Amino acid sequence: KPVVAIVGRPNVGKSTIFNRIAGERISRIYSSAEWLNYDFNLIDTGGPFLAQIRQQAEIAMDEADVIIFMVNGREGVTAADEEVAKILYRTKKPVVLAVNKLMRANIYDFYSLGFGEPYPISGTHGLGLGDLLDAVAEHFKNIPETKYNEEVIQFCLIGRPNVGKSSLVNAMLGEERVIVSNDAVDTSFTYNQQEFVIVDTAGMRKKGKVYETTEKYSVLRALKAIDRSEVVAVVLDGEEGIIEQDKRIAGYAHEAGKAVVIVVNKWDAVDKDESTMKEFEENIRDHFQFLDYAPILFMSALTKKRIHTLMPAIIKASENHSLRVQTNVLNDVIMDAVAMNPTPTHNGSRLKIYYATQVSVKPPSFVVFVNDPELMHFSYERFLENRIRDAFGFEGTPIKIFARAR
Ligand SMILES: Nc1nc2c(ncn2[C@@H]2O[C@H](COP(=O)(O)OP(=O)(O)O)[C@@H](O)[C@H]2O)c(=O)[nH]1
Annotate 265-313 with three-state secondary structure.
ECHHHCCCCCCHHHHHHHHHHHHCHHHCCCCEEECCCCCCCCHHHHHHH
Whether residue 281 contacts residue 151, with contact meaning beta carbons closer than 8 Å, is answered with no
CB of 265 sitting under 6 A from ligand 1: yes
CB of 302 sitting under 6 A from ligand 1: yes
CA 227 to chain centre: 11
Atom number in ligand 1 closest to CA 165: 20
Q: Report long-range pairs for 174-181 (Cβ below 8 Å, ≥24 apart).
A: 175/307, 175/308, 175/311, 177/311
Phi, psi of 71 (to 5 degrees): -125, 165
Domain borders along the chain are 1-145, 146-323, 324-406
Burial of 212 (0-12, 13-18, 19+ CB in 10 A): exposed
Whether residue 132 contacts residue 112, with contact meaning beta carbons closer than 8 Å, is answered with no
Q: ∠ at Cα 25 (23, 31), nearest 5°?
A: 45
- Which residues lie closer than 8 Å to 367 by C-beta, 6 or more apart? 111, 116, 356, 357, 359, 401, 402, 403, 404
- Which residues lie closer than 8 Å to 264 by C-beta, 6 or more apart? 235, 236, 237, 238, 280, 284, 296, 297, 298, 299
* Percent of residues in the chain assigned helix, strand, coil, to nearest 5: 35, 25, 40
Instruction: Decide which of 3.30.930.10, 3.30.56.10, 3.40.50.300, 3.40.30.10 is the CATH code for 146-323.
Output: 3.40.50.300
- Give the three-class secondary structure for 195: strand
Give the integer Cα–Cα distance in Å for 132 and 33. Answer: 15
Asked, as a colleague might, if the bond just before 94 is cis with ω within 30 of 0, I would say no
- For the 1-145 domain, the top CATH level (class) is alpha beta
Q: What resolution, expressed in A, was reported for this entry?
A: 2.2
Which residues precede a break in the chain, with C-to-N distance above 2.5 Å? 27, 47, 102, 182
Give the integer Cα–Cα distance in Å for 70 and 48. Answer: 20
Write down the architecture of domain 324-406 according to CATH: 2-Layer Sandwich (3.30)
E strands of 44-186, at which residues?
A: 66-72, 95-100, 118-121, 153-158, 178-180
Among 162, 167, 305, say which to mutate for ligand 1: greatest number of ligand atoms within 8 Å of CB.
167
Residues at the binding site for GTP are: 8-15, 44-47, 100-102, 159-166, 200-204, 265-268
Give the integer Cα–Cα distance in Å for 217 and 235. Answer: 18
Q: Comparing C-alpha atoms, which of 171, 206, 201 is closest to residue 186? A: 201
Show the 3-state SS of 200-233.
CCCCCCCECCECCCCCHHHHHHHHHHHHHCCEEE
Atom number in ligand 1 closest to CA 167: 15
Taking CA atoms, 10 is separated from 77, 119, 230, in Å, by 14, 19, 34
Residue spans of alpha helices (H) in 112-239: 129-137, 165-173, 216-228
- Give the three-class secondary structure for 148: coil
Give the integer Cα–Cα distance in Å for 101 and 374. Answer: 33
* Number of C-beta neighbours around residue 199 at 10 A: 26
Beginning with the edge strand found earlier in the chain, give each strand of the sheet holding 365-370 in spatial order.
Answer: 353-360, 365-370, 400-405
CB of 161 sitting under 6 A from ligand 1: yes
- Residues forming beta bridges with residue 241, ordered by sequence position: none
Residue spans of alpha helices (H) in 64-185: 79-88, 107-111, 129-137, 165-173
Evaluate whether 1-145 and 146-323 have a shared fold. yes
Q: Comparing C-alpha atoms, which of 167, 230, 214, 183 is closest to residue 396? A: 230
Whether residue 87 contacts residue 54, with contact meaning beta carbons closer than 8 Å, is answered with yes
Whether residue 142 contacts residue 228, with contact meaning beta carbons closer than 8 Å, is answered with no
Whether residue 344 contacts residue 88, with contact meaning beta carbons closer than 8 Å, is answered with no
Give the integer Cα–Cα distance in Å for 361 and 61. Answer: 16
Phi, psi of 403 (to 5 degrees): -85, 135
